[PDB]
Enzyme design. Structure first.
Site, PDB file in Angstrom:
ATOM      1  N   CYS B  65      47.005 -25.625  86.454  1.00 21.50           N
ATOM      2  CA  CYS B  65      46.921 -24.244  85.570  1.00 21.50           C
ATOM      3  C   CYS B  65      45.787 -24.529  84.657  1.00 21.50           C
ATOM      4  O   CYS B  65      45.790 -25.347  83.838  1.00 21.50           O
ATOM      5  CB  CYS B  65      48.122 -23.857  85.194  1.00 21.50           C
ATOM      6  SG  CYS B  65      48.237 -22.621  84.118  1.00 21.50           S
ATOM      7  N   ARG B  68      46.904 -23.414  80.591  1.00 25.14           N
ATOM      8  CA  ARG B  68      47.945 -24.027  79.614  1.00 25.14           C
ATOM      9  C   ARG B  68      47.770 -24.114  78.328  1.00 25.14           C
ATOM     10  O   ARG B  68      48.732 -24.707  77.558  1.00 25.14           O
ATOM     11  CB  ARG B  68      48.008 -25.499  80.379  1.00 25.14           C
ATOM     12  CG  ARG B  68      48.590 -25.658  81.599  1.00 25.14           C
ATOM     13  CD  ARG B  68      48.731 -27.033  82.217  1.00 25.14           C
ATOM     14  NE  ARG B  68      47.620 -27.551  82.611  1.00 25.14           N
ATOM     15  CZ  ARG B  68      47.035 -28.655  82.657  1.00 25.14           C
ATOM     16  NH1 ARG B  68      48.025 -29.563  82.617  1.00 25.14           N
ATOM     17  NH2 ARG B  68      46.227 -28.987  83.569  1.00 25.14           N
ATOM     18  N   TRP B 237      49.125 -13.736  82.738  1.00 22.34           N
ATOM     19  CA  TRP B 237      48.052 -12.468  82.936  1.00 22.34           C
ATOM     20  C   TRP B 237      47.322 -13.265  84.017  1.00 22.34           C
ATOM     21  O   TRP B 237      47.153 -14.480  84.025  1.00 22.34           O
ATOM     22  CB  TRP B 237      47.230 -12.140  81.898  1.00 22.34           C
ATOM     23  CG  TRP B 237      47.130 -13.282  80.887  1.00 22.34           C
ATOM     24  CD1 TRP B 237      45.817 -13.847  81.171  1.00 22.34           C
ATOM     25  CD2 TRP B 237      47.557 -13.710  79.691  1.00 22.34           C
ATOM     26  NE1 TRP B 237      45.512 -14.861  79.999  1.00 22.34           N
ATOM     27  CE2 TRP B 237      46.530 -14.889  79.212  1.00 22.34           C
ATOM     28  CE3 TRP B 237      48.514 -13.514  78.857  1.00 22.34           C
ATOM     29  CZ2 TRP B 237      46.716 -15.588  78.074  1.00 22.34           C
ATOM     30  CZ3 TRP B 237      48.915 -14.142  77.711  1.00 22.34           C
ATOM     31  CH2 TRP B 237      47.986 -15.213  77.197  1.00 22.34           C
ATOM     32  N   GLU B 242      41.074 -14.606  90.432  1.00 23.09           N
ATOM     33  CA  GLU B 242      42.124 -14.520  91.328  1.00 23.09           C
ATOM     34  C   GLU B 242      42.356 -13.373  92.401  1.00 23.09           C
ATOM     35  O   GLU B 242      42.532 -13.309  93.371  1.00 23.09           O
ATOM     36  CB  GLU B 242      43.495 -15.032  90.654  1.00 23.09           C
ATOM     37  CG  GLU B 242      43.759 -16.253  89.470  1.00 23.09           C
ATOM     38  CD  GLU B 242      44.828 -16.403  89.159  1.00 23.09           C
ATOM     39  OE1 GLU B 242      46.046 -16.876  89.549  1.00 23.09           O
ATOM     40  OE2 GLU B 242      45.114 -16.003  87.807  1.00 23.09           O
TER      41      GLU B 242
HETATM   42  C1  HEM Z   1      48.757 -17.091  80.592  1.00 13.39           C
HETATM   43  C2  HEM Z   1      48.127 -16.977  81.809  1.00 13.39           C
HETATM   44  C3  HEM Z   1      47.906 -17.882  82.977  1.00 13.39           C
HETATM   45  C4  HEM Z   1      46.767 -17.807  83.513  1.00 13.39           C
HETATM   46  C5  HEM Z   1      45.350 -17.078  83.188  1.00 13.39           C
HETATM   47  C6  HEM Z   1      47.042 -18.797  84.393  1.00 13.39           C
HETATM   48  C7  HEM Z   1      45.965 -19.387  85.348  1.00 13.39           C
HETATM   49  C8  HEM Z   1      46.133 -19.813  86.510  1.00 13.39           C
HETATM   50  C9  HEM Z   1      45.508 -20.008  87.811  1.00 13.39           C
HETATM   51  C10 HEM Z   1      44.077 -19.411  87.916  1.00 13.39           C
HETATM   52  C11 HEM Z   1      46.199 -20.880  88.568  1.00 13.39           C
HETATM   53  C12 HEM Z   1      45.609 -21.266  89.956  1.00 13.39           C
HETATM   54  C13 HEM Z   1      46.208 -20.278  91.247  1.00 13.39           C
HETATM   55  C14 HEM Z   1      45.401 -20.392  92.434  1.00 13.39           C
HETATM   56  O1  HEM Z   1      44.246 -20.787  92.507  1.00 13.39           O
HETATM   57  O2  HEM Z   1      46.280 -20.237  93.382  1.00 13.39           O
HETATM   58  C15 HEM Z   1      47.426 -21.065  88.199  1.00 13.39           C
HETATM   59  C16 HEM Z   1      48.133 -21.886  88.829  1.00 13.39           C
HETATM   60  C17 HEM Z   1      49.417 -22.422  88.233  1.00 13.39           C
HETATM   61  N1  HEM Z   1      49.946 -21.880  86.948  1.00 13.39           N
HETATM   62 FE1  HEM Z   1      49.189 -20.902  85.629  1.00 13.39          FE
HETATM   63  N2  HEM Z   1      48.236 -19.401  84.301  1.00 13.39           N
HETATM   64  C18 HEM Z   1      48.797 -18.691  83.545  1.00 13.39           C
HETATM   65  C19 HEM Z   1      50.190 -18.837  83.059  1.00 13.39           C
HETATM   66  C20 HEM Z   1      50.955 -19.612  83.594  1.00 13.39           C
HETATM   67  C21 HEM Z   1      52.426 -19.849  83.278  1.00 13.39           C
HETATM   68  C22 HEM Z   1      53.089 -18.783  81.942  1.00 13.39           C
HETATM   69  C23 HEM Z   1      53.132 -20.720  83.961  1.00 13.39           C
HETATM   70  C24 HEM Z   1      54.372 -21.351  84.002  1.00 13.39           C
HETATM   71  C25 HEM Z   1      55.351 -21.036  82.818  1.00 13.39           C
HETATM   72  C26 HEM Z   1      51.976 -21.352  84.851  1.00 13.39           C
HETATM   73  C27 HEM Z   1      52.158 -22.172  85.811  1.00 13.39           C
HETATM   74  C28 HEM Z   1      51.132 -22.312  86.817  1.00 13.39           C
HETATM   75  C29 HEM Z   1      51.442 -23.161  88.068  1.00 13.39           C
HETATM   76  C30 HEM Z   1      52.849 -23.858  88.253  1.00 13.39           C
HETATM   77  C31 HEM Z   1      50.376 -23.142  88.926  1.00 13.39           C
HETATM   78  C32 HEM Z   1      50.377 -23.646  90.191  1.00 13.39           C
HETATM   79  C33 HEM Z   1      50.915 -22.805  91.391  1.00 13.39           C
HETATM   80  C34 HEM Z   1      50.934 -23.401  92.574  1.00 13.39           C
HETATM   81  O3  HEM Z   1      51.277 -24.540  92.779  1.00 13.39           O
HETATM   82  O4  HEM Z   1      50.875 -22.768  93.656  1.00 13.39           O
HETATM   83  N3  HEM Z   1      50.719 -20.462  84.538  1.00 13.39           N
HETATM   84  N4  HEM Z   1      47.373 -20.607  86.631  1.00 13.39           N
HETATM   85  C1  LIG Z   2      51.686 -17.850  86.329  1.00 17.11           C
HETATM   86  C2  LIG Z   2      50.543 -17.423  86.952  1.00 17.11           C
HETATM   87  C3  LIG Z   2      49.600 -16.717  86.388  1.00 17.11           C
HETATM   88  C4  LIG Z   2      48.303 -16.776  87.017  1.00 17.11           C
HETATM   89  N1  LIG Z   2      47.144 -16.098  86.573  1.00 17.11           N
HETATM   90  N2  LIG Z   2      48.030 -16.862  88.273  1.00 17.11           N
HETATM   91  C5  LIG Z   2      49.193 -17.815  88.840  1.00 17.11           C
HETATM   92  C6  LIG Z   2      48.763 -18.484  90.303  1.00 17.11           C
HETATM   93  C7  LIG Z   2      49.786 -19.359  90.996  1.00 17.11           C
HETATM   94  C8  LIG Z   2      49.402 -19.434  92.557  1.00 17.11           C
HETATM   95  C9  LIG Z   2      49.878 -18.031  93.106  1.00 17.11           C
HETATM   96  C10 LIG Z   2      49.284 -17.791  94.799  1.00 17.11           C
HETATM   97  O1  LIG Z   2      49.392 -19.356  95.336  1.00 17.11           O
HETATM   98  C11 LIG Z   2      49.766 -19.227  96.610  1.00 17.11           C
HETATM   99  C12 LIG Z   2      48.371 -19.131  97.248  1.00 17.11           C
HETATM  100  N3  LIG Z   2      47.694 -20.351  97.128  1.00 17.11           N
HETATM  101  C13 LIG Z   2      48.801 -21.397  97.030  1.00 17.11           C
HETATM  102  C14 LIG Z   2      49.987 -20.498  97.238  1.00 17.11           C
HETATM  103  C15 LIG Z   2      51.245 -21.219  96.642  1.00 17.11           C
HETATM  104  C16 LIG Z   2      51.387 -22.515  96.972  1.00 17.11           C
HETATM  105  C17 LIG Z   2      51.558 -22.670  98.388  1.00 17.11           C
HETATM  106  C18 LIG Z   2      51.910 -24.028  98.947  1.00 17.11           C
HETATM  107  C19 LIG Z   2      52.135 -24.427 100.298  1.00 17.11           C
HETATM  108  C20 LIG Z   2      51.995 -25.212  97.838  1.00 17.11           C
HETATM  109  C21 LIG Z   2      51.930 -24.923  96.680  1.00 17.11           C
HETATM  110  N4  LIG Z   2      51.947 -25.801  95.673  1.00 17.11           N
HETATM  111  N5  LIG Z   2      51.346 -23.773  96.186  1.00 17.11           N
HETATM  112  C22 LIG Z   2      50.473 -18.211  87.966  1.00 17.11           C
END
Ligand code: HEM
Ligand SMILES: Cc1cc(N)nc(CCCCCO[C@H]2CNC[C@H]2Cc2cc(C)cc(N)n2)c1
Ligand code: HEM
Ligand SMILES: Cc1cc(N)nc(CCCCCO[C@H]2CNC[C@H]2Cc2cc(C)cc(N)n2)c1
Ligand SMILES: C[C@H](O)[C@H](O)[C@H]1CNc2nc(N)[nH]c(=O)c2N1
Ligand SMILES: C[C@H](O)[C@H](O)[C@H]1CNc2nc(N)[nH]c(=O)c2N1
Ligand SMILES: [Cl-]
Ligand SMILES: [Cl-]
Lengths: 362, 362
Positions: B65, B68, B237, B242
């Site tokens: 993320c 953060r 947000w 994305e």
């Molecule tokens: C405040 C604005 C936020 C922005 C702009 C942001 C941005 C992002 C982005 C761009 C990703 C990559 C997603 C992808 O390419 O699939 C991501 C992943 C992630 N974010 Fe954030 N995020 C935000 C808030 C949060 C919050 C509030 C949490 C949790 C409390 C969080 C937890 C995560 C997690 C766990 C992932 C990994 C998800 C996965 O494994 O699929 N984010 N974030």
């Molecule tokens: C909170 C938050 C804010 C923000 N701006 N963006 C996000 C994005 C979280 C990822 C959402 C989409 O994730 C889907 C599409 N790519 C990965 C899939 C989620 C995923 C799948 C698998 C198999 C594993 C994994 N760790 N995560 C989350």
């Protein structure tokens, strides 16, 4: 124990190499000869066929290279016969001429005598045979900062740059036995350069950007079957993003994006306008266009990725494991538009291969 | 042995948590209570302060993320009291309303009762609380292919989509004891959507693109001190890429780049024209513009990277190790224009954290 490591790498290489060459029957006999050569002499000498195939395998195994589809057409020039600095200089000039091929670039490697006891026979100081100098003093920044330390070392040796942003560095290399390297100015007739113009923005010419035609990496070590060819310069053609997204764009290189933004007529004030991104795309279009217009080989990153996908398919069909470094394979422009981005790669190091080595300067 | 793993994760968490909260003195006593609670009951219950700080630490530790920097302002809603499907539905509707906040988005997490014996109390089927349906049959592709399997599962449950490209999926979740999940249609009044227009290409509206305002991830598990909160939906947000570089652009998602190219008036014929790249940049400008114009929070990838650099600096100043996954941190548009691209990150997993879990459908 030195004989031991060398012998092991040689068995592995000759077996693999001769198998690919369909010469599997000749392995046992070739290995015998090698075994007594190492005993008698402390080393062994590759046949022209081994050296050629080895250089080709090394390219195929370069995890960071997207251009690998063409590994088997590498042009290998065997210069293990050189003994004098005039011979090295002329081998290096010839490599530039023949690889350039009037713009229709031929992937080529020139192989110099290998290390003997860890002792280099020829030590090339250039990072690429053709590269621009960099200067940084008293706030002033001229040329390519990536060249600033080698540039300073050349100027310790009595060379003096004109301090344009595109001074060509001389060839500089040291022969074993000499305590100092020699340098030779590149004949400008050998060096193709491309001025950067845009296909439809006439003002783009006002930036007076240019780049050189051929990337000829001259500071890596080729390792083949335990033999260390520390001097073996090799070249391909550029992928446009190397020039447009990194050399001309990076803040620590030529840093041209603000200037690009101005000539294409967009504001460079707000991150949300994505002006860097827009500038990047236009600069990269210009680069591809300019090379094409001048008749110098180049590949765009989409075509390059599409070629790499065929390399992957070919590896599978041949029963070879594919290795790659995802972090270097993805292009720096629209990486998610390539298939590379959406899969993973095993970053194992397989030999023969090309390796980074420490610079003699700095 | 279950008590054993749980106890170990609890010691580690309470110690770390109370240290950060400056409550280090209260650890020995809090741990005592926990120890006998695990003995008596087989588990333990977090205080409101532990649960809040845990959810916040979990965000801070999410290697993928870029957002953060704002971990410590996460709004934690404690819904461990829910026992009925009406309560869950209303907690989920409230999360949407309060996180949306009329467009000025508040990063929020709603925490449902945790797993008991590995037994889920509430099992959410949605990947995000707000997402579009996908359909694929007889050559026809409608909506978001990423939703195609959940969409098919909802339609097994008596839901029927209108088969527009932007059908909102219902909330769908199962309560322990029920063999089937229930579904509830989202009140459209709660769901902000943004139509995509371009700041200076009027024809861009002809694509009739839109996206929803708030990404509310509802299928990950929050682990805090050994407690498994498999149902804890959270939102931030969007970062513009994305939406613009992946959801609307990917060939396996909405696949809109050829259509984008046409309305911005460029040919989509030659890789060397870099039309995908140019289309990507324009689509991403449109997305940022449209969210801004509608007064819905969004961040561009340059500002996001600049915020992440401050997160790195803050981690260093606090003496915390930074962890990150370079492969997900880099944006998919101009990644080399961010500092992220030019450094490496330790991809170690630190707890508390959010984790992927298996889907109950498919
Ligand atoms: C405040 C604005 C936020 C922005 C702009 C942001 C941005 C992002 C982005 C761009 C990703 C990559 C997603 C992808 O390419 O699939 C991501 C992943 C992630 N974010 Fe954030 N995020 C935000 C808030 C949060 C919050 C509030 C949490 C949790 C409390 C969080 C937890 C995560 C997690 C766990 C992932 C990994 C998800 C996965 O494994 O699929 N984010 N974030
Ligand atoms: C909170 C938050 C804010 C923000 N701006 N963006 C996000 C994005 C979280 C990822 C959402 C989409 O994730 C889907 C599409 N790519 C990965 C899939 C989620 C995923 C799948 C698998 C198999 C594993 C994994 N760790 N995560 C989350
Ligand atoms: C034919 C055209 C070729 C293209 C388009 C191409 C493309 C590339 C690109 C884009 C990189 C990444 C460079 C960076 O970002 O710093 C690279 C790396 C590399 N290429 Fe290729 N390449 C080609 C030919 C060759 C040849 C002929 C060899 C050797 C015989 C080679 C060996 C390598 C190696 C070793 C690296 C890694 C260099 C390092 O570690 O610094 N490539 N290539
Ligand atoms: C043959 C060829 C064709 C082509 N189109 N492109 C290339 C590019 C090779 C990379 C050239 C520039 O590499 C410099 C700048 N980035 C990495 C640095 C070389 C390097 C440095 C270090 C410390 C390690 C390493 N393995 N490689 C090579
Ligand atoms: C420069 C730094 O090491 C960075 O992590 C890498 C990763 N990605 C790259 N990819 C390519 N093709 N070339 C590079 O120089 C780099 N830099
Ligand atoms: C999809 C595939 O796993 C791929 O390797 C990853 C890597 N880079 C990514 N980066 C982000 N932010 N999001 C993604 O979905 C992916 N995909
Ligand atoms: Cl280069
Ligand atoms: Cl999303």
């Amino acid at each position: 124990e030195e004989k031991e490591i060398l012998w092991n790498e040689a068995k592995a290489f000759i077996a693999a190499c001769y198998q690919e060459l369909g010469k599997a029957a000749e392995v046992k006999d070739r290995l015998a000869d090698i075994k007594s050569e190492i005993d008698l002499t402390g080393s062994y000498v590759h046949t022209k066929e081994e050296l050629e195939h080895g250089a080709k395998m090394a390219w195929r195994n370069s995890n960071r290279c997207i251009g690998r589809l063409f590994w088997n057409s590498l042009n290998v020039i065997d210069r293990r016969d050189v003994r004098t600095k005039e011979e090295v200089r002329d081998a290096l000039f010839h490599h530039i001429e023949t690889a350039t091929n009037n713009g229709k670039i031929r992937p080529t490697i020139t192989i110099f005598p290998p290390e003997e006891k860890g002792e280099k026979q020829v030590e090339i100081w250039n990072h690429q045979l053709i590269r621009y100098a960099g200067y940084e003093s008293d706030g002033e920044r001229i040329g390519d900062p990536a060249s600033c330390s080698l540039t300073a070392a050349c100027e310790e040796l009595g060379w003096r740059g004109e301090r344009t942003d595109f001074d060509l560095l001389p060839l500089i290399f040291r022969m074993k036995g000499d305590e100092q390297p020699v340098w030779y100015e590149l004949p400008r007739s050998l060096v193709i350069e491309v001025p950067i113009t845009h296909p439809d923005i006439e003002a783009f010419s006002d930036l007076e950007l240019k780049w050189y035609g051929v990337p000829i990496i001259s500071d890596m070590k080729l390792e083949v079957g335990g033999i260390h060819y520390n001097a073996a310069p090799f070249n391909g053609w550029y992928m446009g993003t190397e020039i447009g997204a990194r050399n001309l764009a990076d803040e620590k290189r030529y840093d041209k994006l603000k200037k690009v933004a101005s000539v294409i007529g967009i504001a460079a004030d707000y991150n949300t306008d994505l002006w860097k991104d827009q500038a990047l795309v236009e600069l990269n279009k210009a680069v591809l266009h300019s090379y094409k217009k001048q008749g110098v080989s180049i590949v765009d990153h989409h075509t390059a990725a599409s070629q790499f996908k065929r390399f992957e398919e070919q590896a599978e069909e041949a029963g070879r494991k594919l290795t790659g470094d995802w972090t270097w394979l993805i292009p720096p422009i629209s990486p998610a538009a390539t298939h590379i981005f959406h899969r993973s790669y095993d970053n194992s190091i397989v030999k023969p291969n090309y390796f980074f080595q420490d610079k003699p300067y700095e």
